[PDB]
Symmetry: C3
Subunit: 602 residues, 3 copies
Amino acid sequence: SYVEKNLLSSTTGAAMVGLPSGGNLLQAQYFVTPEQFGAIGDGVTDDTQAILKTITFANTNNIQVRADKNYRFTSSIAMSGVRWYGGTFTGNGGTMISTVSCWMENVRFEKCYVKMLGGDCRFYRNIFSNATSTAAFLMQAMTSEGTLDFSYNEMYGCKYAILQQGTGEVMTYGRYSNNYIHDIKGDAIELNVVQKHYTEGLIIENNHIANVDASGQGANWGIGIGVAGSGPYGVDVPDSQYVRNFSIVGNRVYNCRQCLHVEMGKNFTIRDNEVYPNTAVSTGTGLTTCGVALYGCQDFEVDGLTGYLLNDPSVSTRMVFIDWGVNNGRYAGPPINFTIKNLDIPESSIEIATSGSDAWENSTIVSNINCNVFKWRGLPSSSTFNNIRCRSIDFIGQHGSGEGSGGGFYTRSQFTYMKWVGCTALSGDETTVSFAKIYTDRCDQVGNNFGVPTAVDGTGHRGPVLTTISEQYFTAYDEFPGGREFPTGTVIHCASGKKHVVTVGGAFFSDNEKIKATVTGQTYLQSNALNWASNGYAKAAGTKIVIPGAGANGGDLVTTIARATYVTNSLYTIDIADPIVTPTAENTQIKALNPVTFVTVN
Amino acid sequence: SYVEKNLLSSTTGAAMVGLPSGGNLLQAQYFVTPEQFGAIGDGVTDDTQAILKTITFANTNNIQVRADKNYRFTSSIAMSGVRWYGGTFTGNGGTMISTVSCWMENVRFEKCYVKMLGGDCRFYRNIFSNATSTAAFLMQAMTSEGTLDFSYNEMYGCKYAILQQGTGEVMTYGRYSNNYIHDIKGDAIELNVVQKHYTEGLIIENNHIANVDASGQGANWGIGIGVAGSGPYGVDVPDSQYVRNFSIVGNRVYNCRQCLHVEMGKNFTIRDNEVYPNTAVSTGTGLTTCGVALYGCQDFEVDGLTGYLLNDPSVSTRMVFIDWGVNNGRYAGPPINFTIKNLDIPESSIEIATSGSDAWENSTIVSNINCNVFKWRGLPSSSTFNNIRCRSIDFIGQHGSGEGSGGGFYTRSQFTYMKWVGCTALSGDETTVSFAKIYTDRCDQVGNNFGVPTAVDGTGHRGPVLTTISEQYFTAYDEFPGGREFPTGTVIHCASGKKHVVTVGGAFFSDNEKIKATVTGQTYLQSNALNWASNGYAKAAGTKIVIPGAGANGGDLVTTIARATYVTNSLYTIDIADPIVTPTAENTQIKALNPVTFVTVN
Amino acid sequence: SYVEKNLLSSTTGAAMVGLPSGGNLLQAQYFVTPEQFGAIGDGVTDDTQAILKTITFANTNNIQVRADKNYRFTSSIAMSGVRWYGGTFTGNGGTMISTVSCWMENVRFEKCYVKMLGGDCRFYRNIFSNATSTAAFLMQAMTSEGTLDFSYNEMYGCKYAILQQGTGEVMTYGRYSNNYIHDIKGDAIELNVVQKHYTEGLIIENNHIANVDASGQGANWGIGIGVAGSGPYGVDVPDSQYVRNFSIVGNRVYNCRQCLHVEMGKNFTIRDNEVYPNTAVSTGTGLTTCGVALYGCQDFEVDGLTGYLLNDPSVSTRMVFIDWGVNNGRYAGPPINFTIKNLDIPESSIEIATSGSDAWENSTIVSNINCNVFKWRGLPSSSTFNNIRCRSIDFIGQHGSGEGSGGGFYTRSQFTYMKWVGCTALSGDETTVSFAKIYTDRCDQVGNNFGVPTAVDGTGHRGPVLTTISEQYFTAYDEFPGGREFPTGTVIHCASGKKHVVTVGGAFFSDNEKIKATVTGQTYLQSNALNWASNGYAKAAGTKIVIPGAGANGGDLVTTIARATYVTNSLYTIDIADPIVTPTAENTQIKALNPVTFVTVN
Ligand SMILES: C[C@@H]1O[C@@H](O[C@H]2[C@@H](O)[C@H](O)[C@H](O[C@@H]3[C@@H](O)[C@H](O)O[C@H](CO)[C@H]3O)O[C@H]2C)[C@@H](O)[C@H](O[C@H]2O[C@H](CO)[C@H](O)[C@H](O[C@@H]3O[C@H](C(=O)O)[C@@H](O[C@H]4O[C@@H]5CO[C@@](C)(C(=O)O)O[C@@H]5[C@H](O)[C@H]4O)[C@H](O)[C@H]3O)[C@H]2O)[C@@H]1O
Ligand SMILES: C[C@@H]1O[C@@H](O[C@H]2[C@@H](O)[C@H](O)[C@H](O[C@@H]3[C@@H](O)[C@H](O)O[C@H](CO)[C@H]3O)O[C@H]2C)[C@@H](O)[C@H](O[C@H]2O[C@H](CO)[C@H](O)[C@H](O[C@@H]3O[C@H](C(=O)O)[C@@H](O[C@H]4O[C@@H]5CO[C@@](C)(C(=O)O)O[C@@H]5[C@H](O)[C@H]4O)[C@H](O)[C@H]3O)[C@H]2O)[C@@H]1O
Ligand SMILES: C[C@@H]1O[C@@H](O[C@H]2[C@@H](O)[C@H](O)[C@H](O[C@@H]3[C@@H](O)[C@H](O)O[C@H](CO)[C@H]3O)O[C@H]2C)[C@@H](O)[C@H](O[C@H]2O[C@H](CO)[C@H](O)[C@H](O[C@@H]3O[C@H](C(=O)O)[C@@H](O[C@H]4O[C@@H]5CO[C@@](C)(C(=O)O)O[C@@H]5[C@H](O)[C@H]4O)[C@H](O)[C@H]3O)[C@H]2O)[C@@H]1O
Ligand SMILES: [Mg+2]
Ligand SMILES: [Mg+2]
Ligand SMILES: [Mg+2]
């Protein structure tokens, strides 16, 4: 009347054991484990065949796998339809596990990698550690269309972490969110030639990436997050060559040679990312150091960016780099129809190369920027520049050969529009801007601390020649205000009713100016003739001046007034931004860099 | 000395089996399974009663349920306090499972739906598939106050996915985050008449929604994400009728007739959503196609929007639609106190209808916009418009009957303020704006490529009559600059000291202008008399001109200069934006659309 | 031939039971449970020793723990390397569980707290309820370097929820995301003196916090989210004293005395948070009520803020408070190099106290703001103010002793720059601004509804004395436009060619103005002499006026025209913003607050 030794060991033996529910143990087997198929789980014993039987059994009976041990395996394993919770797989270094419609949580993939081959796959709260394959999580040549949620995983110690190659069946939708990827030697997330994919959306969001160092590795290795469509680049190539409708939002990329990269992307947004590039990592892989690098892209925004470069600024300050593509050594595919905005990168610089044509429109917006150098090439059909705080401007509109990517390639004889509102180029006391070849038919400009010159490409080609009057002042006195630069066209209205019109932009310094002798290294000047605390002979900080003979080897010294008139040692004094190089003798003149001409009415 | 066959099958039988811990199997029963209560799990056998006993046992003993099979059930199941992990429920199509204070993970609800009835409920990493009930996840007539975290679930194949009806006990807090909802025939997330709910917050964030097609379904079906308070609409109805303090952030809604909808919302934010409306889906359900539709709302912002419409633009370009509500065929409840900003939707259009009164203030801000048509009705007590790039402006301030929602209903005789700074209305070569009925006491305007006319509603009612001078220019020459439009009040300062004041805004074209004969379809004009490459007879691109007799049936052709003066075939030439319709003979005049009048001082 | 009673109970007994896989029950033991070590799980029996053996066994054999019951424990438990799923721990109130490299999910920590001591720890989907210890989740004196993911947990009923004390080994990286913290009596998230920590990043994002009420508790208790570096404060103290490179993004903090707090932070961002402060909670703990409070911080942005205060506005409207630090009763450490932008807080106020020096630069940006009072102290080396909508401005540049934090401490004689573009100070009909001590060398200002006066700190010290002309108007008539305020320097161009230049800013009211008698409480005035519907004697709403003798005790009444000229009862009428206090007799004069002086040319 007792249970037999046999039968209890049979495939129905658990049916003999009662449980508090009133059912039996056989009814409690909601899973299988690899140990039930012979796995040792010691991380050393070869468990490959045990794993294969588990997968076969789970597929055939549609039963989830539970595991907690460490399964050493030595050759490829194919999985289809499996739900797997827990455990560690330990490959040879780069051994492959393929998944079709697989759901995996709390798994550690040690010294191996997962290759997704199709279906609806889901990966949560896993660890991918120490892979020596090209990628730790690979999407390539899928045999059926896929969707993917790849979220809250941690990946480290590998080469590429997440890599997609766009051959095969399409991924229609993918979310890559809240992963933690660190201490790797390839890209953290690279989606290569995926223009056909992600029709219903690609979203790469809230990933935290740290220490991407591809030193000594292959070409292009070491990008933080990268998305690539298909060449050839070109302003008019078909929409189907581009990766479209995707977003890269809220990620953090620390200590990486090139944090964010897109080429041949269209209709996309790069929003609120935080990046810390470093010239010193991924040595030899050929990447241009920066936070955001975009090539040949159209119809996109960069909206919100923070961080700074970790290397010394003398090596690089490049943070935003928006450029043409290249086909076989020839530039092609200017970026067009884009918005750069809300960047908070005061230490770091922006470089943009675009274009404009009669054959297609290009409308650009740059807005709400805090940066270091703002460097720009190209003349869109319309370009607006609003609330840019920068430390210098390096700007050429219709740039020619030798003046930047695609110089000379396109021109636009039709209506060309530009606007500059509320911008500030200022570093300490210096306002440092350079503008050229702005062949605009209309240019509105207000609220800037500088004037923007526009140019004419052949007589009559941009309408009547006009100068926008951006500054007008009132003085309670009649004498022209000295020592302060005014652009051409500036009007001064006097309380008496007189008015001055500036016909050659510049500043007034009397021909009777005399300064005290100077010595090398001196950063102030003192008056030996005129009253610099009068309005007519005043000295305004920010004004560019020339001190004859005071520069290197007796050249003229061009400098900036750093502090306006004050009295010390009973003399009128100003400070200059650059020290005297060659000493000057008593009663040397000082002059404006740009001497004003004005006319007076009444 | 051997175990009996009986007793081992008893409810304590597992106590006889030793484990490596040194305990017994009975101590390892941390869960129950449905199979322990007779469930077959084959998806075909009716397991309803087995499921009910499981729920009873789990509730009574506070023990979690584990499952992995497929439980066909055929009538309603009520659950309270249950923690359930895994398995598939398969109903008849719309069979109900109710939950009170339930926690569910990794469950598939197939052909059935969950109805939440109260407590603190949590749903993670579930699938809701193929429901034929009205909603797949329903909140209605809760019998106790609730909180809800509904996150990282996938829902598809249903009618409504998530639906709340606000009757019963309140949901005090709810987070709906990171769900994937697709291929449905009702709304993806609809919270209807929930003004009493969400005192401690409603947050709808980072959901990815795709393919919402309610064609052939009931009224209003097919909204992407919708939130509704209670009628009647009205500017002064009680705060308690509104859904308040909620947020809709970071969602993606692809291929949906009306992606985001709020009515009777107050103190809310719609931030950084990406939407792709489509006129072709939800045929017959009566929705206005767009990305964001807001009715009767107050104290809100739309901050950040991307995407575009999937249908052909000839059918619709409507993306943002902010409008009054309607009570029984009468408009009521103008939107007031709102901010529209940071929209990146260059292909798509914005339509806003508001109002202003002496009885209440309405302060509006529209800022940092990239859009197609900007259409506006209504005159707030203060309205600011900053850094708007658009392709046309269609604007009426105090709009009357027949000119938009609520036209004529309210007026404001007190101080009314408006500002336009740094805006651009431009499509290729055309600046296309229409303004009327701007009855402002002060209007500041700078940095725009157009002038904003203000109007007076009865003599003296807006102070002395002033025209803001928005443009002033300098010329090195005395002749008036030809061929370029200047608003009324424009001042031209000459290097000689002369000045021109524009007393009737417009452009100068000499009465002696003669052009060569033209033929139908021609898009250029050539001079037969004057030197168009002189400043006085210049031709600026963007200027609107009239070619007598060249329009349809010999009407005048109003067009725009597309390219300023150039020489070809030894003649001064300009391009026009619109082709000649009716041919013109040699020595026809060309004129400004708006002929200038100016006076010259000196 | 039957199984023995013994042996089946042995540590290998499960090996005798067959399963459908063909393996045995021993191979299915992927976990241990506390009941296998003697735990009763009734929440009452002391299970402390049972828990300790479980931890020992799990550590020694590297096996996960599963649990579902309620384990009462009574003294500290140390855990290292454990993977624990499920169950409830119930301490004495504040009993400690320590973790080193622990992974915990679906656990409830009742009346106890977790103290993290190092390694890589992970906490998901847990509940921390009713702790009476100082904190429910404590990081302090870690014995090895840590990383932490603390996400999707719920915490309530405690004192501090999450607290870190920065002594011991560093946390190199931490993500605190998507938690739900409510009904607590300390801070929700407080990271105190952690300047050495988070080299690879600190990210606090998408947490929902509600009801933080530290009434009756210790000093500083009741902050929503707080991050603190190390004193002493000071503009030039070493970088190592600051918490750096962190972010506080997307959180919601409802009903809290001080929602967000940072002191001694550098290179950080506070982005898109929603906050609802309340003066009534945390009574006695000494916190300044507001949404965001920053002390002594540098190189940071506040980007995006919504919400409002829950108390009556008469008690407080303070929402943003950016201030110096304090060392031993002396202010020190001005905030420098910061950007305040994208704030949508129309009901609530902003208070900023900064500084500027020759010894270091300070570049500030305030942009795209909707607020109530905008209060500012301090004169940076460069400061820009763009698209600020506010209800009043309270501004002093180089503020002195008694005029705000750090008044008098620093001055900058070198180039000092300021810009105001497109700002609006307006409350109903009143434009209420106060500016002083703006000692700038250049100040660009356009598109505002007010003028910004700049000042000179000693003759000659800011260059020639200039007034920016911010407004110019055109009139079709010659008479000066009456009843409307114009800043000094305003130019009016007449259609006749005449021009008026405003030499003393103000408004024109004729000396022949006479009004009808008034009575107390009256809010309109009526003309008894002049035609107020003429341009020369016009009355513009918004103009500040003086009614002699009409204020309290026969003082002059200074008020604002609320409605421009209209006719009622056959008399020219205006409305005023403030009622008559002391009655005035027939034929009293009305005057401008600021009487204009102008000169006319021609
Ligand atoms: C050096 C290089 O590194 C990676 O590529 C980088 C980068 O260097 C490259 O320049 C490119 O950079 C992008 C750039 O073009 C674009 O302009 O900008 C992007 C930024 O947005 C840049 O990222 O792409 C990067 C990813 C490697 O991907 C790359 O590999 C490729 O070249 C080598 C030749 O040197 C090989 O030819 C690779 O070929 C693949 O190799 C696998 C493999 O595992 O062997 C094949 O797979 C299969 O066959 C094996 C055989 O064994 C069995 C039978 C088994 O045991 O199971 O099956 C195995 C496996 O499961 C099978 O799938 C692939 O089919 C094959 O395509 C080629 O990918 C290079 O190393
Ligand atoms: C056509 C319509 O579709 C949905 O409503 C849509 C939309 O059409 C409608 O216009 C509205 O649109 C909103 C609009 O008003 C506002 O202005 O803008 C919003 C955008 O922000 C728009 O969304 O709301 C939308 C949701 C349906 O919700 C709607 O249903 C309603 O009308 C029909 C009549 O045609 C019914 O009267 C519905 O009544 C509910 O029906 C259920 C039910 O299951 O039968 C009731 O429940 C219970 O009783 C059954 C009986 O069986 C047992 C005993 C059992 O076996 O267990 O219990 C069952 C169940 O568990 C019980 O709860 C509800 O109580 C009852 O209210 C009504 O909802 C319509 O179909
Ligand atoms: C009142 C106060 O509340 C908290 O501190 C608040 C706040 O009041 C304080 O002003 C400060 O505020 C910050 C402010 O300075 C800065 O400027 O701005 C920040 C905003 O960004 C403000 O937050 O910090 C806040 C957190 C408490 O933290 C604080 O505690 C501290 O003071 C008291 C004295 O009144 C104690 O001295 C605390 O000392 C700690 O106490 C524990 C303990 O549990 O006893 C010690 O731990 C250990 O020893 C016990 C003994 O038992 C065993 C043997 C066992 O049974 O296992 O081990 C136990 C435990 O496991 C051991 O760790 C700590 O080592 C010790 O440091 C002191 O923290 C005060 O209550
Ligand atoms: Mg777009
Ligand atoms: Mg608000
Ligand atoms: Mg920074």
